[PDB]
Amino acid sequence: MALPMIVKWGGQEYSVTTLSEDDTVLDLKQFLKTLTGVLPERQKLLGLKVKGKPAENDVKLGALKLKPNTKIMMMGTREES
């Protein structure tokens, strides 16, 4: 599942929000893989974006309606490339 949370791994601090209703998780997804390109490779989040079963694109703000208060944390998300 893709919850609208914010990632701040010290050096790297991105935004894993759900975006506007008009948009979708698929959008940010491409922006994350293109900006970090580490999520689709290796990562250890507290729960957001699990391996062996990544969130779906159908997921949207109107489908989550969550808040950023969740605060997501990333671990071992460095490729140095």
Swiss-Prot record:
Task: Look up what happens after changing L46A.
Answer: No effect on proteasome binding or nuclear localization
Location in the cell: Nucleus
- Please give the superkingdom of this protein's source: Eukaryota
Q: Where is the Ubiquitin-like domain?
A: 3-81
List residues modified as N-acetylalanine: A2
Q: Summarize the impact of K49E.
A: Loss of binding to PSMD2 and PSMC2, and loss of inhibitory effect on proteasome activity
Q: What is the reported tissue distribution?
A: Broadly expressed, with highest levels in placenta, lung, testis and ovary. Up-regulated in tumor tissues.
Q: What does this protein do?
A: Dephosphorylates 26S nuclear proteasomes, thereby decreasing their proteolytic activity. Recruited to the 19S regulatory particle of the 26S proteasome through its interaction with 19S component PSMD2/RPN1. Once recruited, dephosphorylates 19S component PSMC2/RPT1 which impairs PSMC2 ATPase activity and disrupts 26S proteasome assembly. Has also been reported to stimulate the proteolytic activity of the 26S proteasome.
Assembly and partners are described as: Interacts (via ubiquitin-like domain) with PSMD2/RPN1 (via C-terminus) which is a 19S regulatory particle subunit of the 26S proteasome.
Q: What is known of its domains?
A: The Ubiquitin-like domain mediates interaction with proteasomes.
Protein name stated in the entry: Ubiquitin-like domain-containing CTD phosphatase 1
Show which stretch of the intact protein is covered.
1 to 81 of 318
